[PDB]
Each structure stands twice: as structure tokens, then as C-alpha cells.
Amino acid sequence: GMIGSEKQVNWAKSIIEKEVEAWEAIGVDVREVAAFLRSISDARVIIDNRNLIHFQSSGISYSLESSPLNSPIFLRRFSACSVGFEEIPTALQRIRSVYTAKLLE
Amino acid sequence: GMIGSEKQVNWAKSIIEKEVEAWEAIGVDVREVAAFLRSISDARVIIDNRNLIHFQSSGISYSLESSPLNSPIFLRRFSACSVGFEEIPTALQRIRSVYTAKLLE
Amino acid sequence: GMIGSEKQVNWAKSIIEKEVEAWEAIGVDVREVAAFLRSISDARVIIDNRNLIHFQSSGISYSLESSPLNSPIFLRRFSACSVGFEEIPTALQRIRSVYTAKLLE
Amino acid sequence: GMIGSEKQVNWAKSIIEKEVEAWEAIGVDVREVAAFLRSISDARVIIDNRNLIHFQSSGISYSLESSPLNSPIFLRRFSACSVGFEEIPTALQRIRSVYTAKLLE
Amino acid sequence: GMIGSEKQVNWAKSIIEKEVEAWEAIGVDVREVAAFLRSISDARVIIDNRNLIHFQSSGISYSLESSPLNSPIFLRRFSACSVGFEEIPTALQRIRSVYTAKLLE
Amino acid sequence: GMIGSEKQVNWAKSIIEKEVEAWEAIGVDVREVAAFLRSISDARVIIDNRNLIHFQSSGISYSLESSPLNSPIFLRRFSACSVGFEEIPTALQRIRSVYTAKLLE
Numbered sequence: 001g002m003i004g005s006e007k008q009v010n011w012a013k014s015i016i017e018k019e020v021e022a023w024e025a026i027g028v029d030v031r032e033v034a035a036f037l038r039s040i041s042d043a044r045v046i047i048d049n050r051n052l053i054h055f056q057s058s059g060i061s062y063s064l065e066s067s068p069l070n071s072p073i074f075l076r077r078f079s080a081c082s083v084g085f086e087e088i089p090t091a092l093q094r095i096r097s098v099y100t101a102k103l104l105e
Numbered sequence: 106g107m108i109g110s111e112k113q114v115n116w117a118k119s120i121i122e123k124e125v126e127a128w129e130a131i132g133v134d135v136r137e138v139a140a141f142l143r144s145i146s147d148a149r150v151i152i153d154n155r156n157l158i159h160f161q162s163s164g165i166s167y168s169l170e171s172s173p174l175n176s177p178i179f180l181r182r183f184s185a186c187s188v189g190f191e192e193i194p195t196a197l198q199r200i201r202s203v204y205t206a207k208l209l210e
Numbered sequence: 211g212m213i214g215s216e217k218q219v220n221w222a223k224s225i226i227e228k229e230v231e232a233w234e235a236i237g238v239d240v241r242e243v244a245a246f247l248r249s250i251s252d253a254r255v256i257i258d259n260r261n262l263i264h265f266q267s268s269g270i271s272y273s274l275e276s277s278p279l280n281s282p283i284f285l286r287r288f289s290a291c292s293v294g295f296e297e298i299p300t301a302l303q304r305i306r307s308v309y310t311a312k313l314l315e
Numbered sequence: 316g317m318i319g320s321e322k323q324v325n326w327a328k329s330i331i332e333k334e335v336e337a338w339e340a341i342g343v344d345v346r347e348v349a350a351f352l353r354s355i356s357d358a359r360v361i362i363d364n365r366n367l368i369h370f371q372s373s374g375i376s377y378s379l380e381s382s383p384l385n386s387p388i389f390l391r392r393f394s395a396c397s398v399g400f401e402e403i404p405t406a407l408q409r410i411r412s413v414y415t416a417k418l419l420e
Numbered sequence: 421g422m423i424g425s426e427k428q429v430n431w432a433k434s435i436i437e438k439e440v441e442a443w444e445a446i447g448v449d450v451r452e453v454a455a456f457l458r459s460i461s462d463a464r465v466i467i468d469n470r471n472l473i474h475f476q477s478s479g480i481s482y483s484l485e486s487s488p489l490n491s492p493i494f495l496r497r498f499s500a501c502s503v504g505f506e507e508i509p510t511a512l513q514r515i516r517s518v519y520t521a522k523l524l525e
Numbered sequence: 526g527m528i529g530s531e532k533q534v535n536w537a538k539s540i541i542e543k544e545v546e547a548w549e550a551i552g553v554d555v556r557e558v559a560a561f562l563r564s565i566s567d568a569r570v571i572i573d574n575r576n577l578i579h580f581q582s583s584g585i586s587y588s589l590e591s592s593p594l595n596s597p598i599f600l601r602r603f604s605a606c607s608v609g610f611e612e613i614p615t616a617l618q619r620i621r622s623v624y625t626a627k628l629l630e
Contacts, residue, residue: 029191061314062388072521073377079522086449086518098191100310101177102184104271134506166629167283178272203506205625206492207499209586239401282626289627296554296623308401311387312394344611376524413611415520416597417604419481482598493587 003081004043012043015050022055026064028098032091033069035084042081049077061103064096108186109148117148120155127160131169133203137196138174140189147186154182166208169201213291214253222253225260232265236274238308242301243279245294252291259287271313274306318396319358327358330365337370341379343413347406348384350399357396364392376418379411423501424463432463435470442475446484448518452511453489455504462501469497481523484516528606529568537568540575547580551589553623557616558594560609567606574602586628589621 002009016037023030023037040046052074056063068074070092075085107114121142128135128142145151157179161168173179175197180190212219226247233240233247250256262284266273278284280302285295317324331352338345338352355361367389371378383389385407390400422429436457443450443457460466472494476483488494490512495505527534541562548555548562565571577599581588593599595617600610 062386065386065388066383068381071377071380072517073380073525076521076525086514089517090514094191094195097177097194100314101181103314104310105178105181167281170281170283171278173276176272176275178275199506199510202492202509205629206496208629209625210493210496282622283630286626286630296619299622300619304401304405307387307404311391315388315391409611409615412597412614415524416601419520419523420598420601482596485596485598486593488591491587491590493590 002041002043002046008043008047012040012046015046016040019053019055022057025057026060026095026099028095028102030095032084033088033095036069036082036088036091039083040078040081045077045081060099064092064099067092107146107148107151113148113152117145117151120151121145124158124160127162130162131165131200131204133200133207135200137189138193138200141174141187141193141196144188145183145186150182150186165204169197169204172197212251212253218253218257222250222256225256226250229263229265232267235267236270236305236309238305238312240305242294243298243305246292246298246301249293250288250291255287255291270309274302274309277302317356317358323358323362327355327361330361331355334368334370337372340372341375341410341414343410343417345410347399348403348410351397351403351406354398355393355396360392360396375414379407379414382407422461422463422466428463428467432460432466435466436460439473439475442477445477446480446515446519448515448522450515452504453508453515456489456502456508456511459503460498460501465497465501480519484512484519487512527566527568533568533572537565537571540571541565544578544580547582550582551585551620551624553620553627555620557609558613558620561607561613561616564608565603565606570602570606585624589617589624592617 002012004012020034020037023033052068055067069088072089075088078085107117109117125139125142128138157173160172174193177194180193183190212222214222230244230247233243262278265277279298282299285298288295317327319327335349335352338348367383370382384403387404390403393400422432424432440454440457443453472488475487489508492509495508498505527537529537545559545562548558577593580592594613597614600613603610
């Protein structure tokens with residue numbers, strides 16, 4: 001499973017679940033992003049990036065548009081301890097497109 | 106299966122099959138679009154949109170370019186009675202790219 | 211400038227002014243689209259396309275996203291009687307991006 | 316031009332000059348971004364956003380890719396006190412494409 | 421298996437394996453491209469295009485950016501003797517995005 | 526303007542005129558590409574790239590789609606001896622979109 005002390009693994013898992021909850025509160029399919037976050041297997045990387053990745057439930061549109069998960073350069077930091085990072089910028093484009101259309105419809 | 110009276114289901118199914126036939130007459134892979142159309146599970150939504158979704162076999166290039174299946178806002182109307190709508194704009198981009206290259210080659 | 215009979219020219223000019231007013235009611239910069247519409251120099255082409263190009267005030271986002279001005283193929287019909295048609299799909303991407311951001315902000 | 320108290324204007328002007336210098340240290344054409352920054356006419360808006368917009372010289376590629384100037388939603392806050400904000404996301408795509416090619420060549 | 425004489429099949433297979441090796445030396449996931457190349461089932465098409473498809477291990481960034489696998493028109497020549505060509509331009513966009521970010525990070 | 530020996534300048538100027546004529550034979554607006562070609566100010570750079578840039582009249586669509594003028598990395602070689610190279614990939618997208626629509630219409 002996730003690498004790190006028992007304290008770090010406990011902390012990292014609560015960070016990931018909090019983020020997955022934020023993404024799932026949007027109301028459109030985010031399964032690909034939730035699976036990516038749950039695949040991150042290094043507690044120290046999760047903890048160090050807990051604030052940088054944070055998704056703000058106030059202002060969903062801006063949170064989606066400005067998320068560092070949009071950035072391939074940012075996602076390199078997960079390249080050795082995650083699954084599916086190569087597709088995550090594409091996934092955010094789709095999610096932004098779907099959520100934007102839901103709001104505008 | 107599809108929701109609606111027996112008359113509406115019969116009518117909706119003939120609409121969908123007519124559209125699937127139009128898409129399949131293009132001559133490039135359209136399986137993703139055919140599966141999406143066949144997943145629409147509300148006869149009343151199919152009937153109401155039978156003219157808006159219609160694919161004209163005269164002028165395939167323009168039919169592809171102008172199809173409302175290109176539009177995430179339009180596709181919201183299928184969000185609760187279909188499968189795979191989030192990917193359909195992407196699918197049309199690919200199909201347009203493939204068919205255009207076939208014609209130009 | 212505008213070619214056509216006196217009645218066609220008068221009708222076409224009024225169609226264009228109506229369309230420009232619809233685009234300018236959005237509330238974001240549409241000067242490039244307004245200039246393109248006012249550059250169309252063939253009354254018959256304007257008249258024949260008066261319904262295909264019509265911009266509906268009732269649903270601005272969908273009017274923008276579904277407008278045939280998004281389509282290079284559609285715009286070919288103005289190629290011999292307008293200025294700036296090559297840039298209009300780009301202009302619509304920009305306007306859609308600006309107006310979408312304004313609504314979501 | 317710039318609205319605000321004398322101290323706010325002086326602080327805002329120095330913030331903008333600092334940001335322009337950071338962008339101009341990249342070594343590719345950034346004239347459009349420099350012009351946009353120098354067009355912002357509200358000292359309070361500059362001051363309040365001085366950290367959100369700040370361009371870090373230490374990692375140019377990531378600064379470009381993560382800049383909030385990429386975001387139409389973020390730029391809405393300059394819509395009433397600047398010139399050219401509608402084109403700035405496009406400008407950043409171009410600059411990113413040019414600077415990336417220069418580094419990789 | 422692959423169509424052609426025993427000599428042509430031997431030659432074509434060595435061409436494909438040499439290309440797959442070049443793509444795999446990049447150091448990012450290229451499985452989709454390797455599978456596409458290994459799906460090409462006509463030795464004569466592989467042999468005729470051995471130089472056009474060649475990936476230069478000197479200058480990986482330019483080889484990726486300039487590869488004819490980016491071009492749907494070029495890929496039409498494999499439409500009847502390959503699997504997955506419709507997705508290959510998309511795959512190159514992703515690979516370019518991933519490798520570029522790895523280098524820039 | 527153009528640097529080089531008298532023979533190199535004469536050869537380079539004739540190469541550029543040949544290329545401009547090839548681009549202008551397409552029949553859509555290529556003024557921006559023509560201006561860029563005529564802005565190249567180093568005879569040796571033109572001569573060394575005369576075959577890499579050459580535009581073939583026999584297959585216009587593929588010449589457009591495969592042109593190295595699509596590539597920011599390739600264009601870096603003109604960065605110190607031309608005007609407008611940063612916009613040329615965008616220009617080629619536009620020209621490809623216009624010419625494609627003209628053929629398909």
C-alpha cells in the first residue's frame with residue numbers, strides 16, 4: 001500500500017479522501033480523478049502537496065480552471081507514485097466542459 | 106428498456122436506427138456514436154429531438170461539423186437518459202479528423 | 211457597396227442591423243463579428259441565410275456554441291462577399307471563452 | 316490614468332514594473348503581456364492581486380503554465396480596468412509554445 | 421499474420437522492432453504507439469514507409485513534434501492494414517505533453 | 526537587408542520567390558506566410574533549409590498538414606533572422622482550416 005509511517009499514511013489518506021469528497025461534490029462524473037488521487041502511493045508526496053492540490057468547494061468553476069491537475073509539469077511530481085497521471089489534464093478538460101455546460105444549459 | 110408508451114418506444118427506436126444508419130453510411134468508425142444513440146433510454150426525449158439530431162447524408166462534412174452532438178450544452182438534455190455523453194464531443198472531433206483525412210488523402 | 215435590387219438591399223441591411231444588435235446585446239466585445247456581418251456585400255446571400263445565421267437572445271450560451279459562424283464550412287458561403295471570414299471561428303472561440311468566464315465568475 | 320490614493324498608485328505602479336521585468340527576463344516576446352499589465356488602471360486591484368499574479372523567475376516553464384493569466388475566469392477581475400484581457404489566454408498559449416520550443420530545440 | 425513474402429515479412433518485422441525500440445527509448449509511456457506499429461499487417465506498406473516513419477533518437481522533442489504519426493492524412497495509408505490509427509494523433513499529443521513536461525520540470 | 530555573399534543572396538531570394546509562389550497557388554489567403562518567408566534575412570539559413578521547407582503543389586492538403594512551418598521547434602532556426610515566426614503555427618492552423626473547408630464545402 002501507501003509508503004510512509006503509520007502517522008503519515010493516516011494523514012495522507014485523510015487528505016486524499018477529503019479531496020475526493022470535494023471533487024465528488026461537484027455533481028458530474030469525476031471517477032477518473034478520484035481513482036488517480038486514490039492511486040497516489042507515497043504519503044510524503046500527498047502531505048507535501050496537500051495545499052497545492054486542494055480543491056475549493058466555493059467557486060467550483062475557478063477551482064476546476066485553476067487546479068494544478070491541469071498542468072503536466074505539476075503532475076510530474078506524481079509520476080513515480082501514482083497511476084494515470086498522463087491522462088489527468090485531458091480528464092480535467094472533459095470535466096470542465098461537462099460541468100460548464102451543465103451550469104450554462 | 107426505453108421508457109414510454111409502446112407507440113413512443115416504437116417511434117423512438119425507428120428514429121435511433123435511422124440515425125445510426127446515417128452515421129454508419131459515412132464509412133469510418135462511428136461505433137461510439139452509434140452506441141451513444143442506442144443508449145438513449147427515454148422515448149420522449151428521442152422523439153422531441155428527432156429533427157435537431159438528424160444527420161444529413163447529403164453533405165457529410167457539414168453534417169459532422171454542424172451536428173449538435175458537437176455541443177456539450179445540447180448533450181445535457183441526454184444526461185439522465187443515456188450513457189457516454191461526456192465523451193461524445195471528443196468522439197465527433199476524432200471522427201471529423203478521420204473522415205476529413207480520408208477525403209483529402 | 212451592397213449588390214442586389216433596391217428592395218433586397220434594404221431588406222438585407224435591416225437583417226444585418228438586427229443581427230448586429232443581437233450580438234451586441236450579449237455585453238462582451240463582439241466588434242469583430244459586427245464588422246464581419248456589416249462587411250457582407252451581397253444582399254441575396256444575406257437574405258437566403260437570414261434564418262440560418264440568426265442569433266437568439268433567449269439562450270445566449272447555446273446561441274454562441276451552436277452558431278454556424280463557428281463552422282469554416284458554413285462560412286465558405288461568404289468567402290466571395292465579405293471581409294474577415296477566415297478569423298471568425300477563432301473570434302467565436304474567444305467570445306465564447308470570455309462570455310462563459312463572465313457568467314461563471 | 317490610474318485611480319487610487321497617491322500611496323496606492325505608487326505601490327501599484329512599482330508592482331507592475333516588477334512583474335513586467337519578470338516577464339521580460341524570460342527572453343521571448345512578451346510585449347502583449349507587458350502592455351496588458353501596464354494597462355491596468357485600478358491601483359487597488361493591482362495591490363490586491365500582487366501575489367496571485369506574481370511571476371517567479373526560479374521556474375519559468377511552470378510559472379508560465381500555472382500563471383492565472385491563463386484563466387479567463389481569473390482575468391474577469393481586470394475586465395473593467397484594463398485593455399486586452401480577452402486575448403491574454405491566447406497570448407500565454409503562444410508564449411508558452413515559443414519558450415518551450417526554444418528550450419527544447 | 422503479416423502479408424508478404426518471407427523476405428518482406430522478415431524485413432518489415434525488423435523495421436517495426438527498430439522503431440518500437442526508438443519510441444521505447446524515450447522513457448515515457450508509448451505502449452499505444454508500440455501496439456499500433458506492431459499491428460501493421462502488410463509488409464509492403466511497412467517497407468515502403470520505413471524512412472518516412474523513422475523516429476530519430478537524436479532530438480526526441482523534434483522527432484515527436486514532426487513525426488508523420490501526428491498527421492491523420494499520412495495515417496490513412498495504414499487504414500486497411502493496422503489497428504488503432506484513428507487514435508494515434510491523440511496519442512502523440514499526450515506523449516508530447518508528457519515528455520515535454522518531464523524535460524521542463 | 527539580406528546577409529550573405531552576392532551569390533548566396535541571389536540564390537536565397539529565388540528560393541523564397543519559388544516558395545511564395547507555391548503557397549500563393551493554393552488559392553486562399555496566405556499573405557502572412559508570404560510575408561514571413563520574405564522577412565527571412567539570412568541567405569545561408571534559407572539555402573540550408575530550401576528542401577526542408579519546400580511546399581509541394583502535388584498534394585496541397587498534405588503539404589499544409591506536414592509542413593515544418595507547423596512546428597515551433599523547427600521555426601526556432603528563423604528566430605534570429607525573420608519577423609513573425611511566433612504566429613506562423615497559428616497561421617498554418619487557420620490556413621489549413623480555411624483550405625480544408627473550401628475543398629469539403
